[PDB]
Design a binder for this molecule. Structure first.
Ligand SMILES: Nc1nc2c(ncn2[C@@H]2O[C@H](COP(=O)(O)OP(=O)(O)O)[C@@H](O)[C@H]2O)c(=O)[nH]1
Ligand SMILES: [Mg+2]
Length: 656
């Protein structure tokens, strides 16, 4: 009941509204005649369907979901062929070196041309797609599908899937069918030698030869077999399954994952159920009654239900209580989860999305990197009126655990809770996450940028404090030397008091006091970073001095002594991989250098052209729509924070 050669772990990446969701939903209907990844069966093959992100912008989620799957299907709204975003989604496919096939959906829709896809496929996606099926009909006249591979046709009596009759191709669509059979074998002959020789001598190859050959090609990334249908009208979907088994890869065709030994050495993990074990927990999905199910693709070895696996990313052991394969209607308990297969685990306390798992006495291989995002997008948030402040921070509790990658901070002045993250969308999703499924309605603020502040020249000034007989005598007096530290060298304190000049007891306050003003730079009101303070002189009032009057004695000096060291804003200067069609280069490169950018290289990937840059995050708000407009939607870009840098003189002056 387990042959690695019969699995087929696949995804469904479509432009929104192409039918990512409606194709799957109709894919289960046909499979199930007997939710992250959702196993199922078609002619003696298992087909674990990983879920690919909703919006294809999701990059990181996308990265994962990619890594987790073997084959993949692209769904094209056959109104517009490869859609602008369906164009962008192909980019991701191209990237992660994943074999695939394509689905012309909506052939009933008014606006139903196949060739439209084919043309703008090779034309816009550099695909060299191959035609395997020809419609019988056009719009709402669409009556079937021809398989030019096997030279037969299927018909569809009703818009249901109740009626599918195998019919010999109509005399009408015959001369077209024959031309494309040939033209195809010309692509099969491109892979099999025995096929060419039979094309020439005029011999008909064999269905296997054909399909066998076409498969090497689909797989080895040299084509993209192309079928069509309407998932709405329930036609050609079966074929699409007959496709997947035929062309889409088992976990044995795709290459082994690049895993990293702890010594640095990066070795390759070969799909072997009877060897050391490792897996990837990509999806921490919170079930109802069962609890924290974490979803895992297994690469080597076997997962036994009731065992002790090692969370290699965190470092703590985990116990696998039950092993689940979630199906279309119901769950499933299993004892094994072998290699190349996918599923759900029960237990695993401290295991988050991405964490790698290996088994007890097994090599500690990590599969995912170590990216801890520098916090760059600050967002301010009052509750509704402290009716929703209740379930505000108690809401962050669940959110924090399963995702480490975001600050939470109460802002100095306004006391507004402040959420510090990576990207913009990263933050926006949580608003919908909170103002809806968390029942935390409230007052939101515009994304801000993580400006930090610092000095440049070394200063040397004090910070007294006097409030005598109010209510009992109060007093305290510091004298400090501050100098600027190198970038992202952060804080350093030094105590060079001679002795006795200030009481030993009261230093903590001076420190607690410095630390409290470094949350408010004089330039805007952002955390002062990169500095070296030195307490060296002072005075005290023997009775009047107190833990309060030296917290203030000290705060009054870090505040004051900043506005003297020629203060300076620093800003987040990002790193960008913008994907533009080769035609819009001279156009958007201009866009970067308008946003104080500094272009680095340009290296080709696919029919496209990618460009590495140094735009200030400060100049990035709305860059999506500005590039979607300059590439007519064809563009796409990704950020990866790089460093903090100074702001130029004219940049600062305006910053108030
Ligand atoms: N004409 C036509 N419309 C479809 C078909 N499949 C899906 N749709 C429409 O696609 C829209 C959204 O598709 P959806 O399942 O949400 O795809 P997704 O947005 O990419 O996940 C729905 O409003 C459907 O009516 C099809 O085969 N033919
Ligand atoms: Mg959808």
């Amino acid at each position: 009941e387990y042959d690695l050669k019969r699995l087929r772990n696949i995804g469904i990446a479509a432009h929104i509204d192409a039918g990512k969701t409606t194709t799957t939903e109709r894919i289960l209907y046909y499979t199930g005649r007997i939710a992250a990844v959702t196993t199922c069966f078609w002619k003696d093959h298992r087909i674990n369907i990983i879920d690919t992100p909703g919006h294809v912008d999701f990059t990181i989620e996308v990265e994962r979901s990619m890594r987790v799957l073997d084959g993949a299907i692209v769904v094209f709204d056959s109104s517009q062929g490869v859609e602008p975003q369906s164009e962008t989604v192909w980019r991701q496919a191209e990237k992660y070196k994943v074999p695939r096939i394509a689905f012309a959906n909506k052939m009933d829709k008014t606006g139903a041309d196949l060739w439209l896809v084919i043309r703008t496929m090779q034309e816009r996606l550099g695909a060299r797609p191959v035609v395997m099926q020809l419609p019988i009909g056009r719009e709402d006249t669409f009556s079937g599908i021809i398989d030019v591979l096997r030279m037969k046709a299927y018909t569809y009596g009703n818009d249901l899937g109740t009626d599918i009759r195998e019919i010999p191709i109509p005399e009408e669509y015959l001369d077209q069918a024959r031309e494309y059979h040939e033209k195809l074998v010309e692509v099969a002959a491109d892979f099999d030698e025995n096929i060419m020789l039979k094309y020439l001598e005029g011999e008909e190859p064999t269905e296997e030869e054909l399909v066998a050959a076409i498969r090497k090609g689909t797989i080895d990334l040299k084509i993209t077999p192309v079928f069509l249908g309407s998932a709405l009208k329930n036609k050609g979907v079966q074929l699409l399954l007959d496709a997947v088994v035929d062309y889409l890869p088992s976990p044995l065709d795709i290459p082994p994952i690049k895993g990293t030994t702890p010594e640095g050495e990066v070795v390759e993990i070969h799909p072997d159920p009877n060897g050391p074990l490792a897996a990837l927990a990509f999806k921490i999905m919170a079930d109802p009654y069962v609890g924290r199910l974490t979803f895992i693709r297994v690469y080597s070895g076997t997962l036994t239900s009731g065992s002790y696996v090692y969370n290699t990313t965190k470092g703590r052991k985990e116990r696998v209580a039950r092993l689940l394969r979630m199906h279309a209607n119901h769950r499933e308990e299993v004892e094994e989860l072998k290699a190349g297969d996918l599923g759900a685990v029960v237990g695993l306390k401290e295991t988050i999305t991405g964490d790698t798992l290996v088994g007890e006495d097994a090599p500690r291989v990590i599969l995912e990197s170590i990216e801890v995002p520098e916090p760059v997008i600050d967002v301010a948030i009052e509750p509704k009126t402290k009716a929703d402040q209740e379930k505000l921070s108690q809401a962050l509790a669940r959110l924090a655990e399963e995702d480490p990658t975001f600050r939470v901070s109460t802002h100095p002045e306004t006391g507004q809770t402040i959420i510090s993250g990576m990207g913009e969308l990263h933050l926006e999703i949580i608003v919908d996450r909170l103002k809806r499924e968390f029942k935390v309605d409230a007052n939101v603020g515009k994304p801000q940028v993580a400006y930090r502040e610092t000095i440049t020249k070394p200063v040397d000034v004090e910070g007294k404090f006097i409030r005598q007989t109010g209510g009992r005598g109060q007093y305290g007096h510091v004298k400090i030397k501050v100098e600027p530290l190198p970038r992202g060298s952060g804080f350093e304190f030094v105590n060079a008091i001679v002795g006795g000049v200030i009481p030993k007891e009261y230093i903590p306050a001076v420190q607690k006091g410095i630390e409290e003003a470094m949350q408010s730079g004089p330039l805007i009101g952002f955390p002062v970073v990169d500095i070296k303070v030195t307490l060296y002189d002072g005075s005290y009032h023997e009775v009047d001095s107190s833990a309060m009057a030296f917290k203030i004695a000290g705060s009054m000096a870090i505040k004051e002594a900043v506005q003297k060291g020629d203060p300076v804003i620093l800003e987040p200067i990002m790193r960008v991989e913008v994907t533009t069609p080769e035609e819009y280069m001279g156009d958007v490169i201009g866009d970067l250098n308008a946003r104080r950018g500094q272009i680095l290289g340009m290296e080709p990937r696919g029919n496209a052209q990618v460009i590495r840059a140094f735009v200030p995050l400060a100049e990035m708000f709305g860059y999506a729509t500005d590039l979607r407009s300059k590439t007519q939607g064809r563009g796409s870009f990704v950020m990866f924070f790089d460093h903090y840098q100074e702001v130029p003189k004219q940049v600062q002056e305006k910053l108030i």
